[PDB]
Design an enzyme around this catalytic site. Structure first.
Site, PDB file in Angstrom:
ATOM      1  N   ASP B  40     130.766  64.329  89.699  1.00 25.90           N
ATOM      2  CA  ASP B  40     130.171  63.278  88.885  1.00 25.90           C
ATOM      3  C   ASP B  40     131.178  62.141  88.745  1.00 25.90           C
ATOM      4  O   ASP B  40     132.262  62.230  89.320  1.00 25.90           O
ATOM      5  CB  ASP B  40     129.686  63.821  87.552  1.00 25.90           C
ATOM      6  CG  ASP B  40     130.747  64.147  86.509  1.00 25.90           C
ATOM      7  OD1 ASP B  40     130.932  65.348  86.223  1.00 25.90           O
ATOM      8  OD2 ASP B  40     131.317  63.209  85.922  1.00 25.90           O
TER       9      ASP B  40
HETATM   10  C1  LIG Z   1     126.351  57.895  73.626  1.00 26.12           C
HETATM   11  C2  LIG Z   1     127.735  58.429  73.516  1.00 26.12           C
HETATM   12  C3  LIG Z   1     128.705  57.505  74.223  1.00 26.12           C
HETATM   13  C4  LIG Z   1     129.036  57.822  75.681  1.00 26.12           C
HETATM   14  C5  LIG Z   1     130.267  58.689  75.950  1.00 26.12           C
HETATM   15  C6  LIG Z   1     130.930  58.405  77.278  1.00 26.12           C
HETATM   16  C7  LIG Z   1     125.540  58.147  74.684  1.00 26.12           C
HETATM   17  C8  LIG Z   1     124.437  57.257  75.087  1.00 26.12           C
HETATM   18  O1  LIG Z   1     124.456  56.048  74.886  1.00 26.12           O
HETATM   19  N1  LIG Z   1     123.530  57.932  75.753  1.00 26.12           N
HETATM   20  C9  LIG Z   1     123.206  57.621  77.126  1.00 26.12           C
HETATM   21  C10 LIG Z   1     122.348  56.412  77.451  1.00 26.12           C
HETATM   22  N2  LIG Z   1     122.860  55.971  78.735  1.00 26.12           N
HETATM   23  C11 LIG Z   1     122.705  56.755  79.806  1.00 26.12           C
HETATM   24  O2  LIG Z   1     121.668  57.404  80.120  1.00 26.12           O
HETATM   25  C12 LIG Z   1     123.996  56.853  80.566  1.00 26.12           C
HETATM   26  C13 LIG Z   1     123.831  56.676  82.053  1.00 26.12           C
HETATM   27  N3  LIG Z   1     125.096  56.997  82.678  1.00 26.12           N
HETATM   28  C14 LIG Z   1     125.881  56.091  83.254  1.00 26.12           C
HETATM   29  O3  LIG Z   1     125.513  55.189  83.998  1.00 26.12           O
HETATM   30  C15 LIG Z   1     127.357  56.229  82.905  1.00 26.12           C
HETATM   31  O4  LIG Z   1     128.001  54.961  82.832  1.00 26.12           O
HETATM   32  C16 LIG Z   1     128.152  57.133  83.888  1.00 26.12           C
HETATM   33  C17 LIG Z   1     128.684  58.349  83.107  1.00 26.12           C
HETATM   34  C18 LIG Z   1     129.332  56.338  84.458  1.00 26.12           C
HETATM   35  C19 LIG Z   1     127.330  57.626  85.052  1.00 26.12           C
HETATM   36  O5  LIG Z   1     128.209  58.621  85.600  1.00 26.12           O
HETATM   37  P1  LIG Z   1     128.409  58.726  87.190  1.00 26.12           P
HETATM   38  O6  LIG Z   1     127.855  57.409  87.749  1.00 26.12           O
HETATM   39  O7  LIG Z   1     127.670  60.048  87.447  1.00 26.12           O
END
Ligand SMILES: *[C@@H](CCCCC)CC(=O)NCCNC(=O)CCNC(=O)[C@H](O)C(C)(C)COP(*)(=O)O
Lengths: 421, 82, 421
Positions: B40
């Protein structure tokens, strides 16, 4: 509308008494304790000198991270998270519930909280960022400080697609996790919930923090430091551990031929609204949430025969709880038994409420009451049966019904009402 | 002469084979980190940190988001030499 | 009366748009944003360079800690605690509920969570313990890092002695606070709940932590950095703030002649149980959560007319939510409106779900839909009405029903179903 019944079908314990349901219970009933002396140069200069740790190793009843998590995982995640994964593995194995079908996975949720983030990971990352800069900061830093990482990991490993609900309420986390899970199942949101608490934040900085707040026993002797209801009680002893309970709708459990430990009848919550640290001296708050739990369960005070008290060996705290019990139960206060297991496990913070739910459950299942340790004598105000020193058989002329109490900082109170079938 | 490309490629592979989450027998030079090897983003961040130590320079985040396979790391690494 | 009706009678907002219900709403509808450039020596090392701060000062719509908390309290309490007390004061003032009778105090509970502890207090205390010794640790240290201290202070200050429930679910805290409060009131445990979320953790260390996880915009332009549903979305922007809602049983509110904004119909939760980092690209989890909320509310998908999307300007996140909406609503997806307000407020973490509950509530009261900012350009996959750039009126003759979504790390999803009366 409707009301579905909720039962407990699995218990997973990672405690200062060791690991595994049978073993931990046997040690608890036998009067054992996990409170030990602090050792290390980093703990010098702190007034406290005792704590309760999970025994680590490969012998039976010792916690072995490797039996539960892979080598990649061990570096990635915090100590509390690993304990929670451990307790959850054990709980689900104890339950015999392995959801394979989609329908069973969406029926099964998670509610595992963490009382407090481990301060050490914050301090080590902080100093690493100052010294060495941004490019040396681990990407696992934020994941290791989030409270719902435990629930997340469990959910992934066992394919649990139902309600996910992490909460962090400091010392009441475990109780809220179980109560809320009960409510979710009773309401129809899930058929199964894997619920509990984890805390492993014994560190120089956190012990320092609690010592400074006058919260901790200063007694140097692990054998005597924690003494609920005793005249010389002088503060609590910090412990670590996790406990997970599998809750389940009654008919679902019966039809799949599960072994049922006990039934969850009720949940109550209250606020003291007096002061931040000080408990309500009369126990108004404790009384209200106990009563709320009894109302939820449709049970009169006279049907309660055991209470797992929150008593953590503090002067004002133990007295408040005791007052509330006497006012709520009246004459029947002298007919019931009250015990605090904190002399055995120490104060497990976030996990305190989940471990004590486990113990109240097992009390019902074995009709046996764990002792309050170190209670060699008692003052006149404490004139109830606190099951001093030795276990007692639980004998009652009707159903075995217990309460377990959890009080937290800020005057948040929780009570669970648990009954034998 | 500063570097070979057969040689900076041996180091990218060396490092990847050291990384516990990669399974050495699936690790080819063109295997995608997420699609094939099953990592990931957070894991990939660890990979480019290990690369940062191995070649002793800082890769900016913008450029690191791009590197989705070992081959792609070699070419970016190679930008300093010919 | 086993399952009552629940309404919202009070809203308190401390956001990067400013403070106060009318004012914040007007600026939101008008297309304003609180996203600004980081202005610090210590921010240069980190690839994020924008954030959204609550404006401080004594002009209209600016946050003045002094109006809510004494000069001594400012020293002993964290920034998020103070914001939560302020938002709560405003919310109860907006409600007209100031319980003085015992019956009203026990009928009023609190459910205010904090999504993340402020890392800076931990790091500064840690460094002070290392270099100056044990006697330099503040006794207010542990209280300042506990998640339920907000709820504690509100409970004391306004005499709220009903159910107390601090939840910490990181980004889903505010949603759980409101949903659980709804359930408690519907179940009979309380008549009134003061519910919401707070977070104020903009600091070098936390931005560093989130940047490392690839979570944050690297875009330098504060005007463009946060752009839900846009092709060049590259991460979320961290904000700070608090939002509190007064929830109340319907009959109780009517009898006291309260101004009712909207009705809470339903609550749903699920977990993805796939990967902890990415959402399920098909959004199966988001779909199940939304469906569970609709089932709780006894409403079919075709009655929904508005969705406050969780979209935080993430590539995989915004696409997943969009897929879930299309699969659940089918042809009716083209009849409804969807908007993310995160371009205006940034991502308020723990408070995100409570602030968006507030906005969905007001969207009900008026029939006015806040815009998704910065959405100048759109990909074919995103072919719904996202209320681009400018607010839209929405005068359905039928009853106005909205969903608001909160997705968190670990794959936890929450949805609230809120309706005009
Ligand atoms: C809240 C807690 C903060 C984050 C901790 C790091 C979570 C939140 O806002 N929920 C998720 C809503 N957004 C998503 O669905 C996240 C999508 N994921 C992403 O694009 C992230 O930026 C990554 C973790 C970088 C994706 O990971 P890789 O590309 O696998």
């Amino acid at each position: 509308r409707l009301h579905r019944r909720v039962v407990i079908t699995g218990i997973g314990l990672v405690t200062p008494l060791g690991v595994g349901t049978h073993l931990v219970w046997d040690r608890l009933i036998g009067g054992e304790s996990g409170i030990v002396s602090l050792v290390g140069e980093e703990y010098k200069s702190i007034p406290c000198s005792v704590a309760a740790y999970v025994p680590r190793g490969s012998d039976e009843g010792q916690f072995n991270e490797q039996n539960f998590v892979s080598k990649s995982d061990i570096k990635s995640m915090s100590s509390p998270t690993i304990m929670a994964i451990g307790a959850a593995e054990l709980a689900m194995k104890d339950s015999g519930w392995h959801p394979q079908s989609e329908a069973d996975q969406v029926a099964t949720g998670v509610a595992i909280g963490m009382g407090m983030i481990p301060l050490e990971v914050v301090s080590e990352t902080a100093l690493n960022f100052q010294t060495k800069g941004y490019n040396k900061v681990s990407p696992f830093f934020v994941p290791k400080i989030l409270v719902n990482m435990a629930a997340g990991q469990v959910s992934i490993r066992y394919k649990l697609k139902g309600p996910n609900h992490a909460v962090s309420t400091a010392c009441t986390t475990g109780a809220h996790a179980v109560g809320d899970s009960f409510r979710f199942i009773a309401h129809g949101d899930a058929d199964v919930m894997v619920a509990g608490g984890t805390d492993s934040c014994i560190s120089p900085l956190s012990l320092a923090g609690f010592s400074r707040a006058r919260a901790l026993s200063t007694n140097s002797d692990p054998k005597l430091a924690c003494r609920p209801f005793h005249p010389k009680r002088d503060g609590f002893v910090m412990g670590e551990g996790a406990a997970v309970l599998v809750l389940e709708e009654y008919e679902h459990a019966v039809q799949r031929r599960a072994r049922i430990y006990a039934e969850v009848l009720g949940y109550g919550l209250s606020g003291d609204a007096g002061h931040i640290t000080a408990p309500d001296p009369e126990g108004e708050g404790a009384l209200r949430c106990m009563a709320a739990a009894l109302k939820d369960a449709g049970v009169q005070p006279e049907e309660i025969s055991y209470i797992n008290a929150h008593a953590t060996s503090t002067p004002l705290g133990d007295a408040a709880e005791n007052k509330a019990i006497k006012h709520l139960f009246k004459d029947h206060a002298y007919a019931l038994a009250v015990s605090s297991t904190k002399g055995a496990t120490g104060h497990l913070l976030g996990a305190a409420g989940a471990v004590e739910a486990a113990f109240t459950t097992l009390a019902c299942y074995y009709q046996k009451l764990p002792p309050t340790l170190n209670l060699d004598c008692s003052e006149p105000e404490f004139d109830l049966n606190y099951v001093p020193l030795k276990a007692q058989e639980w004998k009652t002329e009707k159903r075995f019904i217990g309460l377990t109490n959890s009080f937290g900082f800020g005057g948040t109170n929780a009570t669970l009402c648990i009954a034998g079938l | 002469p500063p570097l070979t490309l057969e040689g900076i490629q041996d180091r990218v592979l060396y490092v990847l084979k050291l990384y516990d989450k990669i399974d050495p027998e699936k690790l080819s030079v063109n295997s995608h980190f997420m699609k094939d090897l099953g990592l990931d983003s957070l894991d990939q961040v660890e990979i480019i940190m290990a690369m940062e130590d191995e070649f002793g320079f800082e890769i900016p985040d913008i450029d690191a988001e791009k590197l989705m396979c070992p081959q792609e790391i070699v070419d970016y690494i190679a930008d300093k030499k010919d």
